[PDB]
């Protein structure tokens, strides 16, 4: 829970060899032949299925962040998640996702084929429109549950600092607002108001985004899923800081130049009550390179006016978008190995996540390791410890 | 397993030595067995093959390999046993399957060296295992491409090759082709 | 085209662009362009998949999401205006145009919600190409130069293979020559 290893790791292979004080010992010699030597790890507090906490769940859930990689990167951790990963873990997870992106399948066809027309559109009598309440049902199903399951959390493992964390904690939130979304639209598609379509769009493009939790199971996207969100930290608000500070800034400048209809309608010569707006479309549009300049012309000043936008791509495309690219370049060569270790712990905390999820006797089904008489203790009594076996080689210490 | 008193002295030796084995082999003879007594397939599905003498030399043990072979016990049993296979194959430990391949596969020169130029019988160093292998062959098998590995490995490969010249000054032992045609060299290619 | 079936013409047009596309296959007798044919490769394999999974995913999301703010034509026929059977389809590519920096945004604006729709197409230009395509340019230096000594090792195997391939080629007369 603090994050020691040098403790951590002695304690793990700590081999005593002495008859009297072999009890003590977590890393046994079961057998060798020759340059290959089996070894015997102690499971005892590690993994312990349900009845007992587990040091296991301690690292993975309420740890030091800053060192919590080199902690399930020794002598079982690895290997004793990787183990469960092919029983159960890998299994259930892409049952997980498949059961997602169906749910998310049919909160769009509901979407794409919610009438557009009249305050609540009920009038179902068909079977279409009985086959979307199949749909609409379905997804409040899930709205409550992700609400319930993350209030489950709050008096159960939510309150880190949860917001920001690359580790679930960005997902906990947004599982919520899906479910707080989905919630509010299903009021007031019910308390007649039209806006239950408008609700809904956010939920659904927030929901497919979720998606992305589940590339998790995966090195190879979810290494990439950790870099999408730095980068939307560390590269791209320092970005929109900057690149609104100036669109304001020449925005207001442009419209200050043009002639109002207190003049003869026209925007395109003209100036009234939503130039501003458009501006800011077009300027944004302008700097993403998908918008032309089309020179208005139509000012008192139009000189003036063509040097500042020239002035306005130079600085935010030329310059700033470009810079952009190179900062995400150092971005990602900074934070490739840190997004694998991250990664690490997102996937343990996928794996418990499936396992606490489960009822006590199927996790001591499978539960991980081999039992072994270690040696003989208390009145003869044997040592009877779960253990993990873990060939090993060395054509050095003879 | 099919185990026998000399093998479970050998396992459970201590120290270096253990004076129950010349006892047990004094009453060998006597049975009348010593052929057949330094001789056994333990017929375990994961051993085999093993016989006291593969037992003797991977315990690093000296002078109870100079004994067994002394009594005319056998320098060529396949140790064939699943254990006793490449690792491909669901094993741990592949030395080629002979005593002499192992004392190679084993670092262990001095055994290599007495089981050649031993007075009783000897092993010649052509002999192949159930693969074709060699002991050349198989030292190709045991090699890592680790610093401590290919040392010893390079070392004992040339010492047998040199010595094999020597004797039957005749056919180069690494031309020895196994069954599947590749060389030492095509095996480790 | 002997069965009579006119599209010998569909199956031949792939057969074409595949067949120029394999003349890549002859940059390994230089380390010039046999390199350059690798890092195509990996690339496409460890940097632009990952990118059209994600990619694909955020465009149903909000595609889905922005024909759900369109009006039926069963009102006033039209496309600009209307959305019958083939408005899912069109944006997918109007929404590729629009991220690959192609397409011009060009509000549709006939929509119950106008506002909330141009919200979403800008948080999709900012998240499809502001940062996920150049995102992919960095990506691709960190591949390029992880790579790179990699695929001139590659290379050698390439080259060695064609050498062999050809040597195989011959009568046993002509190796021994
Ligand atoms: C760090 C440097 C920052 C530089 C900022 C830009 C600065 C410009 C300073 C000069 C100001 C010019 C003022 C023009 C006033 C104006 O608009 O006057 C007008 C008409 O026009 C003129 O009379 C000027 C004619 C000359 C044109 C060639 C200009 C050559 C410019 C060369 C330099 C370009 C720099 C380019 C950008 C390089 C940026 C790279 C770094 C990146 C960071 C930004 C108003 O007409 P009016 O009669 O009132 O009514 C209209 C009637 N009518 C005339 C149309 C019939
Ligand atoms: C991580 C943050 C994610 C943010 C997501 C975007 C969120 C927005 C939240 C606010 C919701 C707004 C709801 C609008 C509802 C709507 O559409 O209402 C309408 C009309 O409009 C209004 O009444 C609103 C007028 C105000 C306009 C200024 C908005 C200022 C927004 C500023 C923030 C921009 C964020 C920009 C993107 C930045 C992203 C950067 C990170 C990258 C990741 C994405 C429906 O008209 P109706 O009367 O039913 O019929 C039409 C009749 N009529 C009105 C046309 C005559
Ligand atoms: C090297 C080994 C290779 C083997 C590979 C093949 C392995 C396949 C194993 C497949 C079964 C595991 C997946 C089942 C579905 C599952 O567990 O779905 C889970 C949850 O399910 C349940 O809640 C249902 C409870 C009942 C489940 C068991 C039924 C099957 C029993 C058969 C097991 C076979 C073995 C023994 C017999 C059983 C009888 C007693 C022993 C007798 C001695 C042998 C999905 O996760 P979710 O909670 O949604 O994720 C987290 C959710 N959150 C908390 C974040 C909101
Ligand atoms: C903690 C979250 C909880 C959310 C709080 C908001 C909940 C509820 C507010 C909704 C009600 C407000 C309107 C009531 C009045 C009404 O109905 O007003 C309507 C128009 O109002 C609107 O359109 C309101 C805007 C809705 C969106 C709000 C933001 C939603 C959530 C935003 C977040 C999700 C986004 C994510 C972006 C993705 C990128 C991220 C990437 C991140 C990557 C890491 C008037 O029009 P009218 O046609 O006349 O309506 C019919 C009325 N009549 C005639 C029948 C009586
Ligand atoms: C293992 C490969 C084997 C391929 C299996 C496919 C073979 C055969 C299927 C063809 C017959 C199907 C149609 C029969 C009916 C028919 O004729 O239907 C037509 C239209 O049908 C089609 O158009 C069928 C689509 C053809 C393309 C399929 C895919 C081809 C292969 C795809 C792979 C190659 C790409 C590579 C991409 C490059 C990038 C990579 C970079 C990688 C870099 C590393 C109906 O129209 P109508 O005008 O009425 O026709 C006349 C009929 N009438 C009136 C005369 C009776
Ligand atoms: C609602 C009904 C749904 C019905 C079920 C549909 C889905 C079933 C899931 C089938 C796979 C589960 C069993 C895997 C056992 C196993 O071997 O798992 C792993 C290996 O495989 C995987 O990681 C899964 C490979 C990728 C899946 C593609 C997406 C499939 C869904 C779309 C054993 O660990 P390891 O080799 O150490 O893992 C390292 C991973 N590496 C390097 C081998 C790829
Ligand atoms: C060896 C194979 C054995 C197969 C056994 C199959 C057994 C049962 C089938 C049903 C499984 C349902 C399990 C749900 C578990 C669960 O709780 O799922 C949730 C996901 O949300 C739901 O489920 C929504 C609820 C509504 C139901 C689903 C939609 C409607 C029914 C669909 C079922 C049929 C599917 C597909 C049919 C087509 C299949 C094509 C195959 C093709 C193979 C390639 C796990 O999210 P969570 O982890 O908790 O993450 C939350 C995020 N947070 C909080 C951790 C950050
Ligand atoms: C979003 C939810 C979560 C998704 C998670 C699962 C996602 C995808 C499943 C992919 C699993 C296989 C990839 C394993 C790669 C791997 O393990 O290693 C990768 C190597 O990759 C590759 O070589 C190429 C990869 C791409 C292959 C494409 C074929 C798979 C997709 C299936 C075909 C899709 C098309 C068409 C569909 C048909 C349409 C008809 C209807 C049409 C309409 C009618 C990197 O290795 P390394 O460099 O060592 O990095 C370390 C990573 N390491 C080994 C530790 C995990
Ligand atoms: C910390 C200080 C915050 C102070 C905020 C004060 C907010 C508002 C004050 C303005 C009040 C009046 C607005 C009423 C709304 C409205 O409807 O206004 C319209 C005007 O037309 C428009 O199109 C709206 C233009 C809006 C101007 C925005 C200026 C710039 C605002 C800057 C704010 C951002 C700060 C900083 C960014 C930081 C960046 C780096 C990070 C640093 C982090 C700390 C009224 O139309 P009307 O007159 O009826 O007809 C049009 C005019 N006609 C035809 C009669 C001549
Ligand atoms: C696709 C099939 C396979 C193709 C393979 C062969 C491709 C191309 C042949 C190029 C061979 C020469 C290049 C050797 C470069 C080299 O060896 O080293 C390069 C140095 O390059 C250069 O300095 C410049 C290179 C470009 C020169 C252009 C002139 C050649 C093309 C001919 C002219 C084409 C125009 C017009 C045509 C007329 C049109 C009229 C009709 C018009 C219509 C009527 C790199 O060196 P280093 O840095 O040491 O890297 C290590 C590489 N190293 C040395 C170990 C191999
Ligand atoms: C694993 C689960 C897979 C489940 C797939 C289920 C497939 C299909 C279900 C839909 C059946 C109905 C379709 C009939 C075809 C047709 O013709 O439909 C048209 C509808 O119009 C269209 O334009 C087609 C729209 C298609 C919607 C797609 C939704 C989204 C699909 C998502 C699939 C991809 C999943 C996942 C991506 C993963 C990404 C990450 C990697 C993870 C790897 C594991 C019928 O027209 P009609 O009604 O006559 O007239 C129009 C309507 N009007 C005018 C009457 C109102
Ligand atoms: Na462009
Ligand atoms: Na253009
Ligand atoms: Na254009």
């Given at each position: 829970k603090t994050g020691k290893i040098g403790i951590f790791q002695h304690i793990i292979r700590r081999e005593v060899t002495d008859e009297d004080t072999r009890h003590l010992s977590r890393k046994f010699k079961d057998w060798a032949y020759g340059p290959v030597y089996s070894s015997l790890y102690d499971l005892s507090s590690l993994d312990t299925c349900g009845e007992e906490a587990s040091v296991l769940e301690i690292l993975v859930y309420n740890s030091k962040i800053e060192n919590r990689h080199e902690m399930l990167a020794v002598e079982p951790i690895n290997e004793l998640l990787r183990d469960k990963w092919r029983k159960f873990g890998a299994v259930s997870f892409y049952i997980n996702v498949v059961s997602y992106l169906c749910a998310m399948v049919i909160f769009t066809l509901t979407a794409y084929y919610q009438?557009?027309?009249?305050?609540?559109?009920?009038?179902?009598?068909?079977?279409?429109?009985?086959?979307?309440?199949?749909?609409?049902?379905?997804?409040?199903?899930?709205?409550?549950?992700?609400?319930?399951?993350?209030?489950?959390?709050?008096?159960?493992?939510?309150?880190?600092?949860?917001?920001?964390?690359?580790?679930?904690?960005?997902?906990?939130?947004?599982?919520?607002?899906?479910?707080?979304?989905?919630?509010?639209?299903?009021?007031?598609?019910?308390?007649?108001?039209?806006?239950?379509?408008?609700?809904?769009?956010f939920a659904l493009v927030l929901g497919w985004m979720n998606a992305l939790y589940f590339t998790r199971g995966l090195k190879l996207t979810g290494t990439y899923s950790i870099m999408i969100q730095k980068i939307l930290f560390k590269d791209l608000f320092r970005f929109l800081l900057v690149y609104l500070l100036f669109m304001i800034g020449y925005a207001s400048a442009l419209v200050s130049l043009l002639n109002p209809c207190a003049n003869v309608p026209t925007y395109p010569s003209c100036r009234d009550s939503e130039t501003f707006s458009t501006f800011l479309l077009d300027l944004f549009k302008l700097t993403i390179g998908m918008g032309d300049l089309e020179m208005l012309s139509s000012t008192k000043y139009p000189v003036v006016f063509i040097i500042l936008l020239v002035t306005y791509i130079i600085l935010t495309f030329v310059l700033?978008?470009?810079?952009?690219?190179?900062?995400?370049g150092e971005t990602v060569g900074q934070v490739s190995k840190e997004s694998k270790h991250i990664w690490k712990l997102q996937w343990a905390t996928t794996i418990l996540d499936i396992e606490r999820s489960f009822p006590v006797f199927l996790r001591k089904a499978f539960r991980s390791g081999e039992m072994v008489t270690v040696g003989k203790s208390s009145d003869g009594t044997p040592d009877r410890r779960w253990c993990f076996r873990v060939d090993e080689v060395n054509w050095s210490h003879w | 397993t099919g185990k026998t008193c000399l093998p479970k002295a050998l396992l459970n030796l201590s120290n270096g030595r253990n004076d129950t084995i010349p006892v047990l082999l004094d009453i060998a003879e006597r049975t009348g067995n010593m052929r057949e007594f330094i001789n056994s397939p333990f017929r375990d599905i994961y051993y085999?093959?093993?016989?006291?003498?593969?037992?003797?030399?991977?315990?690093?043990?000296?002078?109870?390999?100079?004994?067994?072979?002394?009594?005319?016990?056998?320098?060529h049993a396949q140790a064939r046993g699943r254990f006793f296979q490449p690792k491909d194959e669901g094993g741990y430990f592949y030395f080629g399957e002979l005593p002499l391949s192992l004392a190679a596969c084993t670092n262990q020169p001095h055994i290599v060296n007495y089981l050649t130029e031993n007075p009783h019988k000897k092993a010649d160093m052509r002999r192949q295992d159930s693969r074709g292998n060699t002991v050349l062959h198989a030292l190709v098998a045991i090699a890592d491409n680790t610093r401590e590995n290919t040392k010893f490995v390079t070392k004992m490969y040339d010492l047998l090759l040199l010595k094999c010249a020597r004797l039957f000054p005749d056919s180069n032992l690494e031309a020895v082709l196994n069954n599947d045609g590749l060389s030492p060299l095509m095996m480790a290619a």
């Open positions: 009438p557009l027309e009249g305050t609540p559109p009920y009038p179902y009598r068909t079977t279409v429109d009985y086959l979307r309440l199949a749909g609409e049902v379905i997804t409040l199903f899930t709205g409550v549950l992700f609400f319930f399951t993350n209030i489950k959390d709050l008096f159960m493992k939510k309150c880190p600092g949860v917001n920001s964390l690359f580790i679930d904690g960005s997902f906990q939130l947004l599982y919520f607002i899906y479910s707080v979304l989905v919630i509010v639209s299903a009021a007031l598609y019910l308390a007649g108001i039209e806006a239950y379509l408008a609700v809904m769009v700033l978008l470009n810079m952009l690219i190179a900062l995400m | 085999r093959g093993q016989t006291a003498l593969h037992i003797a030399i991977e315990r690093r043990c000296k002078h109870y390999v100079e004994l067994l072979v002394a009594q005319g016990a056998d320098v």
